[PDB]
Amino acid sequence: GETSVPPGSALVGPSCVMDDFRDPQRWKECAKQGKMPCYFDLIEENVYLMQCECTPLIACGEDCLNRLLMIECSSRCPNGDYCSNRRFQRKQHADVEVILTEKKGWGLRAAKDLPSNTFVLEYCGEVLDHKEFKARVKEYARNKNIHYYFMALKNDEIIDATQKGNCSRFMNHSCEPNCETQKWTVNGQLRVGFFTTKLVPSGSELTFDYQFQRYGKEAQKCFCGSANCRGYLGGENRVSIRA
Ligand SMILES: Nc1ncnc2c1ncn2[C@@H]1O[C@H](C[C@H](CC[C@@H]([NH3+])C(=O)O)[NH2+]CCCO)[C@@H](O)[C@H]1O
Ligand SMILES: [Zn+2]
Ligand SMILES: [Zn+2]
Ligand SMILES: [Zn+2]
Numbered sequence: 001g002e003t004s005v006p007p008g009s010a011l012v013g014p015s016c017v018m019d020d021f022r023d024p025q026r027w028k029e030c031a032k033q034g035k036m037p038c039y040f041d042l043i044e045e046n047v048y049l050m051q052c053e054c055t056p057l058i059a060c061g062e063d064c065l066n067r068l069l070m071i072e073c074s075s076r077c078p079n080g081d082y083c084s085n086r087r088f089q090r091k092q093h094a095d096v097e098v099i100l101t102e103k104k105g106w107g108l109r110a111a112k113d114l115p116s117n118t119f120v121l122e123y124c125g126e127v128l129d130h131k132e133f134k135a136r137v138k139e140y141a142r143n144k145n146i147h148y149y150f151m152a153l154k155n156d157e158i159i160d161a162t163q164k165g166n167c168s169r170f171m172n173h174s175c176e177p178n179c180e181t182q183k184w185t186v187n188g189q190l191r192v193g194f195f196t197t198k199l200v201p202s203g204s205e206l207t208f209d210y211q212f213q214r215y216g217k218e219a220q221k222c223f224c225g226s227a228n229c230r231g232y233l234g235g236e237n238r239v240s241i242r243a
Contacts, residue, residue: 125161174207
């Protein structure tokens with residue numbers, strides 16, 4: 001039939017917003033109605049189980065000697081409060097929104113245009129040793145978990161955001177992604193964040209190469225929709241020249 005501009009429709013009860021992730025009561029109410037994802041413990045930093053030469057004034061921009069090595073500045077930075085290279089410490093996350101996708105579950109989208117190499121969010125979670133990781137892999141498999149939330153931090157430490165983390169846990173995989181992980185040193189401690197790799201326009205889903213699953217043994221259908229989607233996610237090996 002002929003289509004027309006719909007009338008204005010205000011909702012019957014009040015809608016769910018990103019601040020409601022810091023309001024357990026309202027999140028749990030919204031979640032019951034399918035307007036928010038399942039509850040998890042929102043954390044501000046991971047749970048465990050260098051002075052630049054910039055002249056005091058963009059403060060600590062692209063030429064900052066700390067930034068170039070993926071090291072954040074300290075409070076002692078020559079630019080003090082105005083230092084732009086304390087993004088993890090100041091939780092200077094991008095304007096993001098959580099979305100419900102047709103096939104992948106929940107996801108994240110950009111609420112403003114994000115330039116290339118913009119910090120999106122820290123990937124926070126429980127930092128697991130190999131023993132605990134192996135125990136949880138078996139636990140989650142037996143429980144038939146639909147989604148996975150592991151990310152390697154270093155060779156002996158894996159971050160698990162299944163139970164505790166932030167909205168970065170909702171990031172989906174794409175075969176042609178628009179974000180990547182970067183591992184930054186913040187007061188001597190390695191942390192991992194998502195950063196854009198191109199200009200991401202407002203309203204676009206934020207995606208990454210989910211290496212943990214991509215190079216794992218088992219596979220699943222990939223719903224990324226990208227022009228050159230590899231078809232499935234998992235069961236892949238990195239390039240090697242054998243024998
Ligand atoms: N292209 C794709 N095709 C099929 N399935 C996909 C998918 N991209 C994501 N998935 C599903 O999401 C899981 C990953 C979760 C997000 C989970 C989120 N969607 C949710 O609903 O909670 N983030 C991991 C953060 C780093 O550890 C993943 O394992 C797969 O199940
Ligand atoms: Zn600097
Ligand atoms: Zn600085
Ligand atoms: Zn794909």
